[PDB]
């Protein structure tokens, strides 16, 4: 008879080994457990804990949400940049080589807006800067463990300032100086962000965050940007060191990796506790920016998720001037890595209808089986059991397909939400038409804002940017003299 | 190679499409 | 356009002053812009040299370097004690072993396995015994699937070397031919110029030779294992399962099984963010005219220079191009890992 | 070019059983039957040739 | 195989260490104190006391500047990635690849042994002995390579290099190394060759 | 008890088969050898020599330089375009067909 | 034929793609003063080509095409399909395996 | 196949465990046939023997 | 290693824009004048050692 043989499904294994290594190991700690007779350290922010906790492979198994694009529901609130598969960190970690012990030699650039593009005329200037040795701040890790506990450290052997000079003809350079010392020709600069930064605490499980700023001017105001942060993923900058910054993953507040933008439900804006904004009957919900809705009687969703007609319009107007006279994909050069339509990911799935499907039973994870006999029992270890008909998940397809309900959501993983203080939400110019209105340039209003958000079960911050101008002018009247003049406005910052 | 092109054109059309003078 | 004068392109300034501390380093330069020049500050940067230790938590790869093809729950060939004990009148407390013997050969004696021969006189042909310090090599065995020789040998871990599953096992070499055995130091702590290696010899059990032909002299070695103690480690794995609290060598501990340690890339942040202090007025940077001495920076707490710079580069260029000089390589994720997109498998 | 192989869970596969032996009392090096059973070592060691 | 001289596949550019230019056996060029090493274009260095390396490899500050100036006019007023339409397949930054690795410190690691290839084992029992053929041997602890990570990590030394696989090195005879026009400013200087330089 | 089975690391094999076929076979001849009882031609620039010489898979194995971006040191000086994986030559060779 | 010969084992032969060069380089003679090309007005014998040994027309054309267009686009009429290599083969980039 | 190992077999089925009760009254815990033995449960290791 | 090539024929092809003759005869008369000599430059533009 035919040759003795044994059969493997390769394609199912090449997929399970993808899902378990790339998603199962990254499910939050409350989905994990500690094996029989194993002893972990009590500090959960440590590699032996993050490594020692096992995850049952039945979570995110080969069939999980089969047929659909759906980010898993615990994963939406997990930092996606703290993942071993991100090329930018793999590159940065491989650029130093494969050992733990690494001498280094690096060219750190200058970022401060009043200096980073400046031309210095002749003279002698004292230049200083101050540098962190805190490994949780200066290094990053793909797990985000506490490196100040898990044994990292850094030593500086020397720090040298390099300057490279265009070898200009001296009669040209001596002329250029004599023109740039004249007070007509002050160099001037503008911080690219150009905003005032507030962080407000949102307690664990709070769904509402009401905030205000007292009566003040709003001359040349531009609008708002806002996004949400975890408190443990946000270092204090107000100190030399932050001993409670017990984390080393990405730092969205510093680096731009913002990943909780889908957790906002609505924001409303109210000047002087009466003057609602934008008011004037503008939106389909005139007094609130309804960012998303959980149930939709009128049909105000868009784009085949649960983001609204209002919010999608406000975003497509503020990023691209698109919405009036019709939506289309923004041309790629106006759609940068931090733009909206680059990052916007709408999603839909179907689920078994646990209310109307009368033959439903609530099988929890330990009792579910599929690949029994060919798979480990709740562990990434030796196959256990017998072959048997699978009892999970219920089929959504074919002739016996089960009655089912839809769920809809979106992700938006590098944006931060914008609302231009502009009368039609468009950018017609950097100084808007409301920032020089008859009202806001003349009379000092108070502002009340309030947000409704998904509850987190861990402490978070509203990060609120008041977009302003934030400008410097630099006068160099004599050899080795710098005069520098700052005006942020509104929220002017000095006296 | 200092990318060594250097060529003749500086050109344009009529109220749509060209015959010359 | 250009001067003919003898004049540098690049100047490097060492600190005039510095302040290394518990969690910071500070330095001061005299940035002399000389005469008949102008300096663009976009040319300027700090050329840091130093040393990292990334700590024991660093792991720049998925999986394991050592024995990666080994089945998980497969043990290293190894020994334990008190396995078979049948009383009347004693719990006998023998040594016990599991392993394999891949090195085939021509005979076995007190000197171990005969791996080869030489002519000597044609009558005096010398039996070449394996040099126990590195032969038999574990990576040498029968050349083809058909063969089986008369006599066999191999290596095993002595009972004092606690079990680990073979997947991920490493032990450092203790001679230039890759033998792994510890030097003895057991009388006093200097190395004794010899290796902790013993021969153990085996025959088929008296329950499988025919009766009477298994007594008196009928015992005869046909397997030999060069048992040894080694510097055993598992640098990049951990034991995910074992059958009891006992860490020791035992028959059940052959069924331990290991999982590789989770990947943990460590490096400097994108654009070196976090390395310098910004927007932190207790630790502010300085640029002052050396006569005037009053700082022109004037930074604030409600400003965010690092995010402003991250945004600026995405407006000036293509963040998908990595650039080692500024450590620019933007953070990402695999989009098929963020949004699972489960099309099943082509099986 | 390089062959992929599939291997038993225990690593070694189909183990045969053996018993430990020793040279009799150092009397000869006159090899063949001058060995005897070693009572210090288990009568059922698991080994693959 | 490929014929780099005919087809442009140049692949040995990382093998240059330095180049020096000297007119009339006395007039060193570029001279005028220009570079950090005024008389030589030091392309790369194996040891760097002063800290003249860049880009996290061993290429020098001087050379990296000259290549970025000659290909893109970039060095003065700060380095950045050149715009994609000016960074073609034979351009510099498109091809420049810096690299770093760690190796066991064969001098300071006191427990080191020099195990050569026939004696190294890893995946023994599950792999062919020195050949792409049938598996041989027994499962056993691997003796190679030494671990550079974890708690038992071995003392190590860093190695640094770069590759540049389709470029050919350039040195513009231009007074500031930039391309200001196809006929350079030095090329309409030195007509002065009445002393006819060698 | 559990079903009879044998275990295989598919991922290590998909990586080793990549390294051996794409790098071990391209190491300079001085790293190769001639197998026992095999006879090759003396002209080293011939297919029967280039194909007959065997390469030990331990050179460029799964753990070689693990964790790092590092072109192997004998490979830096080896022409990288003389490789079966270059798309331009594959295309130009397949454009004429497979015979 | 013998019982031990049942255990012979084979390896596939090394891949060796053969085709014409990129842009047909090497096919026509250029910069090669034994075998120079001719373009002359049929009446008057003066060749207008006038080539030289220290010139490199083939490299000059390879460089020109990279400045005029995108070499990543193959074109069968001129046999244009630029030489390459897999970057993961030139620089090994050993991230291990997800096993 | 029969993957669930145990201590005894009776009309009540497979004895999957035991409890003290009185030390003399130790009760045999039989598998609840309505869900046990689970098909996904079996012997922990290849050394396999109940 | 046994490769070889044989050429069975070599033909020169030329393609012409079908220009109006009163236009082409005007273009020729402009391009024949020594003021309007065509000029070209080797793209590499170098002496090779």
Numbering used by the authors:
A (entry chain D): 452 to 946
B (entry chain 3): 3 to 23
C (entry chain D): 56 to 402
D (entry chain F): 403 to 451
E (entry chain E): 700 to 897
F (entry chain E): 452 to 550
G (entry chain E): 304 to 402
H (entry chain F): 155 to 204
Can you quote the paper on this entry?
Human adenoviruses (HAdV) are double stranded DNA viruses with non-enveloped icosahedral capsids. Adenoviruses have a conserved icosahedral capsid structure, consisting of three major proteins: hexon, penton base and fiber proteins. Hexon protein, the most abundant of the capsid, forms 240 trimeric capsomeres making up the facets of the icosahedron.
HAdV-D10 has low seroprevalence across human populations making it a compelling candidate for development as a therapeutic vector. The structure of the HAdV-D10 capsid is largely similar to previously published mastadenovirus structures with global pseudo-icosahedral symmetry with a T=25 capsid. The sharply resolved map supported the assembly of models for hexon, penton, pIX, pVIII, pIIIa and pVI. The full length, 949 amino acid, atomic model could be built for hexon protein. A copy of the penton base is found at each of the twelve vertices. The penton base (coloured in cyan in [Fig fig1]) is highly conserved compared to HAdV-C5 (RMSD 0.762) and HAdV-D26 (RMSD 0.492), and similarly is well resolved except for residues 297-324 which correspond to the loop containing the integrin binding RGD motif ([Fig fig1] and [Fig fig1]). The flexible loop contains an RGD motif that engages with host cellular integrins and corresponds to residues 299-324 in HAdV-D10.
